[PDB]
Amino acid sequence: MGKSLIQQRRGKGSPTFKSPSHRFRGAVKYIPLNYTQEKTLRGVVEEIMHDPGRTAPVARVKFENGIEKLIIAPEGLLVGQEIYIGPDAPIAVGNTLPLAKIPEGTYVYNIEGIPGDGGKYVRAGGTYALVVSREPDKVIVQLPSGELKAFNPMCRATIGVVAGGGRLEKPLVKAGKAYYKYKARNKFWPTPRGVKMNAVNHPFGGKEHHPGKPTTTSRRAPPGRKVGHIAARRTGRRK
Amino acid sequence: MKYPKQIRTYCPFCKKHTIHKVERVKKRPRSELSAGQRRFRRILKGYGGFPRPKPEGREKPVKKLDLRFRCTECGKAHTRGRGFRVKKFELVEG
RNA sequence: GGGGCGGUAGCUCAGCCUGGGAGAGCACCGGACUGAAGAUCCGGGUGUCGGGGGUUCAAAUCCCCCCCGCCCCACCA
RNA sequence: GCCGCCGUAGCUUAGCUGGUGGAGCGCCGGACUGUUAAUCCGGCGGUCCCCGGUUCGAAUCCGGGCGGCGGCGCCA
RNA sequence: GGAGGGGGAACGCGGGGAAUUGAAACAUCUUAGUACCCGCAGGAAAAGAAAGCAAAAGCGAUGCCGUGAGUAGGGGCGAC
RNA sequence: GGGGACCCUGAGUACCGUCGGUUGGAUAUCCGGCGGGAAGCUGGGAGGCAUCGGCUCCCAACCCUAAAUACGUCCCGAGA
RNA sequence: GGUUGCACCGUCCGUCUUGAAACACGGGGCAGGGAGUUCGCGGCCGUGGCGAGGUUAAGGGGGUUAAGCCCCGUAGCCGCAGGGAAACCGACAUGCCCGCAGCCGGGCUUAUGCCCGGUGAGGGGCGGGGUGCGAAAGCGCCCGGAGUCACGGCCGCGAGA
RNA sequence: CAGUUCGCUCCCGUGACCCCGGGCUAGGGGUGAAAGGCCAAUCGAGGCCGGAGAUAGCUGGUUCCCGCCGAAUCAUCCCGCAGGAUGGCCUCCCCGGAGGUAGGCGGUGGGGUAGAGCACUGAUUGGAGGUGCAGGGGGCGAAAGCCCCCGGCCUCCUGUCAAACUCCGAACCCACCGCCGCCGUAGAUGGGGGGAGUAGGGUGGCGGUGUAAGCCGUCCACCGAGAGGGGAACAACCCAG
RNA sequence: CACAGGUCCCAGCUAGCCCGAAAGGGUUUGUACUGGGGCCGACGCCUGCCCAGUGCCGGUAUGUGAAGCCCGGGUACAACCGGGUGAAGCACCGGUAAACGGCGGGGGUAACUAUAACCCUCUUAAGGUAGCGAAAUCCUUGUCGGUUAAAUGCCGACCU
RNA sequence: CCCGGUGGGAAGCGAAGACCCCAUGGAGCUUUACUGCAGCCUGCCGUUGCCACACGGCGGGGGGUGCGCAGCGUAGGCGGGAGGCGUCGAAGCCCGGCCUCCGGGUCGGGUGGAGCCGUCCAUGAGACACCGCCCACUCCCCGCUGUGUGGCUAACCCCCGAAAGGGGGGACAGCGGUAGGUGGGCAGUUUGGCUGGGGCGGCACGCCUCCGAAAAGGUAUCGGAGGCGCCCUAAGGUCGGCUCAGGCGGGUCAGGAAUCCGCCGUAGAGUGCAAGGGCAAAAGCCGGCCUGACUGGACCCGUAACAGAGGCGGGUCCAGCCCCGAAAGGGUGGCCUAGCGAACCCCUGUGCCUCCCCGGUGGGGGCCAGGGAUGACAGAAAAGCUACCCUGGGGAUAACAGAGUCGUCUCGGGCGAGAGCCCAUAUCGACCCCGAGGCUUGCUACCUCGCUGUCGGCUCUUCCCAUCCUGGCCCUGCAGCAGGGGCCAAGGGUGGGGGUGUUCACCCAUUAAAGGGGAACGUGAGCUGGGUUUAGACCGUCGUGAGACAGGUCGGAUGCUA
Structure with a gap:
């Protein structure tokens, strides 16, 4: 019988199905070796760039212990904004603090799932998580899908929303322009x-x-x- | 068909006439116990060979006759040729 | 073949373990009820309640042998 | 030309182990109604397509026949 | 300070392991532990002084040759 | 040489149970894997099912081993 | 003997095929090369040795330049008794009758040869026997000594065959 | 010219465009704007080497001569009919040993095909005479009426003919015996052992099917595998071995 | 064929899907405006109806459902035999068709000849809806019309 | 002899034909084919630890609770047992706790303060006289052990950190091992044979009968008729008695039935069931008895003639045991001929041998017989597609063309019912019958599958007449002009266009007339290449799907120097 399929190729990590990693830009790290408690840490937006493979804009941040790392850019950021990391960070937009320290009912992104692993949640253009309820036991956060996941209260997160919203509001236009985007990312195409x-x-x-x-x-x-x-589980749009 | 429950016929053992009693054979289970159980070894991964055996029959529009004839007096049975084909075998009461 | 379930009054079944002459609703005949019809009540009976045999004074379900359908397996030299 | 399957009250359809025969519809006679419709009681006709056969008897089970329904009529 | 690796005509020892074919089909079986593949040693290897043998009698390491014997035994109990 | 406890006498082994591989190996091959798991010679294993008794043999779980047996690189001798 | 004229007859070859001159298939021509082979095992055959036994294989002594042959080894195989799955049991070196060859007798033809009577190995047919099944009976198989080894070849099967 | 070319014409020609060099992905895998396309003159699974002298019931070929005999192309069984095996048949060697019986006559038996027919089983054609009766038409019908009437059901002399009918029944085939013939003691007849070959054709007869030619049986001279002579030639007609 | 656009589906990242003998790996310097898989294939107007069957999904008292263990029996042990316990799975219930797919037959009837808006009947879940139609419809060169002197064409129409 | 030209032939060269069949060939692909195998789900064991809780099962004691119905009354069962109980402190009053059928019993406080019961009998079974052990639901402290849920953190795992150490989660998970389920994702395979080539269809593939079947025997076809794959324990066995369908006359009835009496009546009845054969003091009918459809072991025949051949069946003996019949004598199943099943395996039944030094026990092997399947029936375990194909072959066999044939097709002849105004035959002509041709179709399989290139068209040429015109003629229902019908005749002529791929055919306008047929269905080593039947694609139908279609449709190469 037949050959391996279109998806089975993908899994090999063979190069037609390998993301470029050399035209692509940094990943988010918050760094927990200077810890959250006993904070020391503010930084300055050094520049803002577009990251190709995230399809979103991203910030380079120059920290004041002397390390340079990217943090996923919030809306309404200026170059020369100060971003703080810690709990004794101000409670404002682009500032990063633990969930417990963040109020209830405020919009939040870049939430940790294990404390000190640098952001593994809500790192896409224009979408945002809502802190619905907080209890010292566990803080429940409402995800982009409408769906509630319980996280540790000592996870980090940044106040505000991601930048680069309206992203799918504008169309892709043509097969040419689209071809251009997929090279910028990785996504096997033309797909019949x-x-x-x-x-x-x-x-x-x-x-x-x-x-x-x-x-x-x-x-x-x-x-x-x-x-x-x-x-x-279902299909269609009817009874 | 209907057959008398008891009928006078030849006993090999007594070698003399007596009234005999009719029953009906019956299927034992397998499972220790046999060349066929000894056949359970064969079937390692892959096919058995034999232990793969048929795919379905069946089952011949009649039946044959399957009886036991027991001497009343000694109590010991003797078997006869069957192949005397019968749809159904009924024993009556006396 | 093994295991389990259901076969009951014309019908559909209820009463296994929770035992007796024993059941219920619906069809069907009769009587109430309304100007009418219908529905809804009240009577009537149709199975010792699947066969055959056993323990019980009395057993549908208990026991020994079962027909038939049904479902899960095992199995066909 | 092949291979399945029908015909059952005037019509359409249930049904059959060979001992049977209905339903809805039409129609007919009464009855509500002023008349009538609707509605409401009372009915009936069926060789259960033709024609053989087996049987004690065939509407039923086999032979044949007739008209009506599907499926092949081809790689060649 | 001493060693290792790699090679070597075949042979040898230890691992991985088919199918065409045969069974006039073919799946168990057969090909066959064959072909092919990995590790490795020598001039011979390995085996080797019985927790053996089992004509119950008799023997006292082990290879190898003849034979046992196409025997016992295995197997759609078929082909082998 | 005989006198007392004779020296203790090899562990995941022996053996059992579950799945394979393999073999001729049959219930009675061998080897692995998975689970369980002995004995202190006052003991253990073996004799082609299991178990119990007699009877006969022999010590696994530590190690090495010449020679006789493979080959044809090379030399010589040989040819229905 | 070459060649050619004349008379008469003749539609290649090979293969396929029921039928091929073929409008069936194959071949330009020539040269060379080119196909029933080996082992094991079984069933046959001819021939040879030995003899109720027969033959060695493996081997080392010996001999030889080497080696074969010589003589020595007898393990094992088959045969000498069979039947029965096994347990287990265990038979005719002859009692009876035909008769081929030959021998013996008579008759007959010139002879070979012939017709008829005994005797008859070899052969043929009974009986009695062994064993298995079997209460029994009745069959099955077997029974009054010939095989083994050797050599060539035919043929089967496994092997590329 | 070219194992994929040429000219005219034609499409694209700032682009999802073309191109160079480097570099990645390898065979049930890759790759595919997806045609089962492409992966080095090889792709509905590349090439190389090995297994491998695979195996094929299938095509082709299989080589010196001479002498003697000389076929079957049938049957049963078979995942078998384009093949095997085993018989018949052909051929070779050995054994025992007195008959064997292709031909013809008679005797004693077997028989239902030709033909023939009403004798059955029993299909069917046609009209008289019986008026023996079960019923569809009419009549005085005073009403199944007394009485006749017409499909008709079945006797009779008659009337057509009948794979799977038969009162009968040839020619003819066949069993056994006797006889004669013939054949044998230069060993037949029978027994054992070794070797094969299992596509048929064809005129005629008798068919069965089929408008027919053909198919399929059967016996059949013959061809196969057999010349020569004749039929103009002409596989199988005639003559001839 | 792609294609932009449209839709269905899956996954909270210690995921889902996919590769790998294994260690491990692709997506991923990726995190639901992601990224993975299908269907359809610009726009415009639309997308009826069915969960009977297939498929998927969620669940399952009850029956049922292996090896293991347990208990009973057997065996001086063992094989073995019987029952409970029996998970997924099956039977069972619901959802689900922009999942795969389906989307019917006869009769009778109207001033008059026609037809039947009309009325009966039954399979098997539902009964072809908006549309479009003799078609990239057999019969067939349907028929009518356009078009040609003349057109088994084309086109328009009717449409059973 | 040579040159030049065009290619008619050499079934010219290039091909071991892609079409078709066959082969126990191959391959790709598909699936609810067969069988296996990854992945996934899932139980169990190991990894694998601590607290609790609840909860299932034992296991020891214990502790309430027992309306069959009579009834003093709520008799649960047998058995010892009609007397046990009572200062070894009783009724009978007053409450408390109690389950429950609120039926009513049980029970601690106390007043008391000296009796209460059944034998008796009813009751299907008797004692709340007492004594034992139970069988009910049921509940509980304790001893063992499962399972479920939550907490914990010390294994292990995911994050951070060079490390130190910490974070999230936790005996879950992960990993190892095993069980079941799903599982064309993957792999190996098969998917028969018969056959007017093959497929649907059928099966004549096993078996029985008559015929075909040629008067012994054999004997075929998808050869005619038409069956069996069971039924019967009497539908057998034996014995005695007995004779029938149908028809007639008398009887009853509407008729008729069953029933009745007599007479005829060689087989038309019956004998399970096809057919055929057998049979009348029976094998049929009726009645009684009985169970040989018995055991063992042969011969022979059939199967499968002759003539090898398995399984199966049968006749026919003899031994043993019965049966019946007075006996003779018969019975090896049904009067005969259909009702058929192997090696191996398993189960059954009896008796007997055997299991590795030896005995005993369990559990085995084996001899024999019966029974359980292969109906594709002398037995594989088994679905489809291929126009993406590939191969070995075959003209042993289809498509195409030819040959043969000639149902069909064309044409022609005879007879002449009948009509045409009277008038068969100017003309028209039924029923029926006979020929010729080879021009349509079909049959055939002879030739060809190591390729004789398809149609149609174009172009080029020959031939045939049964003649469309032309010429020469006959008849007439021939007035003319114009027809109808017939004869001779191929010398010549027989066109152009519109649709269709079209040979044919339809139409237009002309024409004297615009005839038919053959030549590899003339003509591809001449052209054309539209159509048929490749590989791309779409729609409809069908199909789970792959995929298919002489259904519709667009596109799809035309080699060679004689």
Whole structure:
């Protein structure tokens, strides 16, 4: 039977399906070796750049212990804004403090999930997490999906929103302009359909336009057969 | 068909006539116990060979007759050729 | 073949473990009720309650042998 | 030309182990109604398509026939 | 201060391990521990002084050759 | 040489249970893996199922081993 | 003997095929090369030694330049008794009758040869026997000494065959 | 010219464009604006080497001569009918040993095909005479009425003919015996052992199917594998071995 | 074919999906305006109806469901036999068609001849809706019309 | 002989034909084919620790609780047992705790202060006389052990840090091992044979009958008719008695039935079931008895003639044990012919051998027989697509063309019912019958599958007449002019356009007339290449899907120096 599929290639880390890492810009680090408690730490926005692979703008920050690292840029930032990191950071936009120290009902981004791992949550253009409720036990934060995850209160986060909103408000326009974007990122394209792909190429669909077996697939289905609507609970838009 | 529960017929053992009693054979289970259990070894990963055995039959529009004929007096049974084909075998009461 | 469940009054079943002459609603016949019709009440009965045999004075369900359907397995030299 | 399957009250349809026969519809006679419709009681006709056969008896199970329904009529 | 690696005509020892084919199909079986692959040693290797053998009698390390014997035994109990 | 406890006498081993690989190895091959797990010679294993008794043999879990047996690089001798 | 004229007859070759001169397939021509082979095992055959036994293999002595042959080794295989799955049991170096060859007798043809009576190895047919199944009976298989080894070849199977 | 070329014409020609060099991804893998395309004159799974002298019931070929005999192309079984095995048949060697019986006559048996027909099983054609009766039409119908009437159900002399009918039944085939013939003691007849070969054709007869040619049986001279002579030639007609 | 646009689906990152014998790895210097997978294929107007069957999903008292362990029996031990305990899985319930797909037959009836707006019947979940249609419709060169002197064409129309 | 030209032939060269079939060939692809294998889910064991809680199962004691129905009354069961109880302190009053069927019993406080019970009998079974052990639900301290939930942190894992150390989570998870489930993601394979080539379809693939079947025997086809894959323990066995369908006459009835009496009546009945064969003092019918459809072991035949051949069946003996019948004698199943099943495996049943020094026990092996399947029936374990194909071959076999044939097709002849105004035959002509051709279709498989290139068109040329015109003629329902019908005749002529890929055919306008057919369905080593039947694609239908279609449709190369 047929060849490995379009997704199975991806997993190899072969180069058509390898992100560039040499035209791409820094990652967020908050650094916990100078700790949150017994803070020492303010910095100055050294410059602001666009990061290609995040599809969002990012800030270089010059810290006052002498380390240079990027922090994902908030809206309404100036070059020469001071950003502080600690709990004794002011409670204002672009300032970074623990969740407990942040009020309830304020918008927040760049939230830690393990204390001191530098931001692994809410680091996309224009989207933001809401602090709905806070208790000394656990602080519950409401995620971009509408969905509530419980985090440790001693996670760090930055007050405000991410910059680079309206991102999908503007369209991509044409196949050319789009081609241009995908080179900037990594996303296998032009991507055709399995339906007129031969029986070898793809599990569903033959020579001509019509599906083989149902599109909807198991949650225990094999690798290389898990294409379509993956483990769909519902489909359509009707009763 | 309907067959008498008891019927007078030849006993090999007594070598003399007596009234015999009719029953009906019955399937034992397997499982220790056999060349076929000894066959359970064979089936390592991959196929058995034999231990893969049929894929389905079946089951012949009739049945054959399957009986035991027991001497009343000694109590010991003797078997006869079956192949006397019968749909159904019913024993009556006396 | 193994295990389990259901086969009951014309119908659908209820009463396993929770035992008796024993059941309920609906069809069906009769009587109330309204100007009318219907629905809704009140009577009537149709199975010792799947066969055959056993323990019990009395057993649907208990016991020994079962027909049939049903579901899960095992199995066909 | 092949291979399945029908015909059942005037119509349309249930049904059959061979001992049977209905429903809805039309129609007919009464009855509400002023008349009528609707509604409401009372009914009936069926060789259960033709024609053989087996049986004690076939609407039913086999033979054949007739009209109506699907499926092949082709890689050659 | 002393060593290692790599090579070597075949052989040797230890690991990984098919299929065409045969069974006139073929899956168990067969090819076969073969082909092919890895590690490694020598001039021979390995085995080697019984927790053996089992004609129950009789023997006292181990290779190898003849033979046992195409025997016992395995196996769609078929082919082998 | 005989006199008392005879010297203690090898562990994840022996053995058991579960899955393979392999073999001719059959219940009775060997080797691994997974789980369990002895004995102090006042003992243990072996004799082709298990267990109990007699009977006969022999000491695993430490180590080495010449020679006789493979080859054809090389030399010589040989040719239905 | 070469060549050619004349008379008469003749549609290659090989293969496929029921039928090929073929409008079936193959071949320019010539030269060379080119296909039933080896081992094991079984079943046959001919031939040779030995003899109820027969043959060594492996081996080392010996001899030789080497080596074969010589003589020595007898392990093992098959045969000499069979039947039965096994337990386990265990048979005719002959009792009876035909008769081929030959021998013996008579008759007959010139002879070879022939017709008829005994005797008849070899052979043929009974009986009695062993064992297995079997209460028994009745069959199955076997029974009054010939094989082993050697050499060539035919043929089967496994092997590229 | 070229194992993918040439000219005219034609599309694109600031772009999702073209191009160079470096560098990445390798065979059930990659890569694919996805054609089963492409991955070095090789792609619906590259090439090289090995397994490997794979195996094929399948095509081709298989080589000195002479002498003697000389086929079957059928049957049963078979995941078998383009093949095997085992018989018939062909051929070779050995054994025992007195008969063997292709031909013809008679005797004693077997038989339902040709033909023929009403004798059955029993299909069917046609009209008289019985008026023996089960019923669809009419009548005096005073009403299944007394009485006749017309499809008709079945006797009779008659009337058509009948794979799977038969009162019958040839020619003819076949069993056994006797006889004669023939054949054998230069060993037949029978027994054992070794070696094969299992596509048929074809006229005629008798068919079965089929408008037919053809198919498929059967016996058949013959061809296969057999010349020569004749039919103009002409596989199988005639003559001839 | 891509394509911009549209939609369905999955995942809280110690994820989902995918590669790898293994260690480990791609996405990822990535974090839901992400990034992964399908379907459809610019715009304009729209996208009916069905969960019966297939598929997916969530759940499951009950039945059922292995090895293990347990208990009973057996065996001086063991094989073994029987029952409970029996997870996912199955039966079972619900959702779900911009998931795969489906989207029917006869009869009778109107001033008059026509048809049937109309009315019966039944399968099997539902019964073809907006549209468009003799088509990139068999019969067939339908028929009518345009167009040609003359057109098995084309086009427009009807449309069963 | 040579040159030049064009290519008609050399079935010219380039091909071991892609079409088709066959082969127990191969490959790719598909799936709810067969069987395996990754991944995923999931239980268990190890990794694997501490507190509690709740909770399942033992295991020891214990502790309330028992309306069959009579009824003194709520009899739970047998058995010892009609007497036990009472200063070894009783009724009977007053409450307290109590479960519960609130049926009513149990029970601690106390007043008391000396009796209470059944034998008796009812009750299907008798004692709240007492004594034992139980079987009910049920509840609980303690001893063991599972399971579920939460807390903890010391293993282990994810983050940070060169390190030191800390953060998140925690016996979860992860990893090792194993079990079950899902699982074309992956891999190996198969998917039969018969056959007017092949496929659907059918199966004539096992077996039975008559016929075909040629008067012995054999004997084929997708050869005619038409069955069996069970039924029966009497539908067997034996014995005695007995004779039938149907028709007639008398009887009853509307008729008729069952029933009745007599007479005829060689087989039309019956004998399970096809067919055929057998049979009348029976094998049929009826009745009784009985169970041989028994055990063992043969011969022979069939199977499979002759003639090797397994399984299976049968006749026919003899021994043993019964049965029946008076006996003779019969019975090896059903009067005969269909009702058929292997090696191996397992289970059954009996008796007997055997299991590695030896005995005993368990559990084995084996001899024998019966039963359980292979209906594709002398037995593999088994789905599809391929126009992406590939190979070995075959004209043993399809498409194309030819040959053969000639149902069809074309044409022609005879007879002449009947109509045409009377008038068969000017003309028209049914029923039926007979020929010729080879021009349509079909049949065939002879030739060809190591390729004789398809159609149509174009271009170029020959031939045939059964003649469309032309010429020469006959008849007429021939007035003319114009027809209808027939004869001779191929010398010549027989066109141009519109649609269609079109040979054919449809239409237009002309024309004297605008005839038909053959030449590899003339003509591709001449052109053209639109169509048919490649590989791209779409729609409809079908199909789970791959994928298919003589359905519709766009596109899709035309080699060679004689």
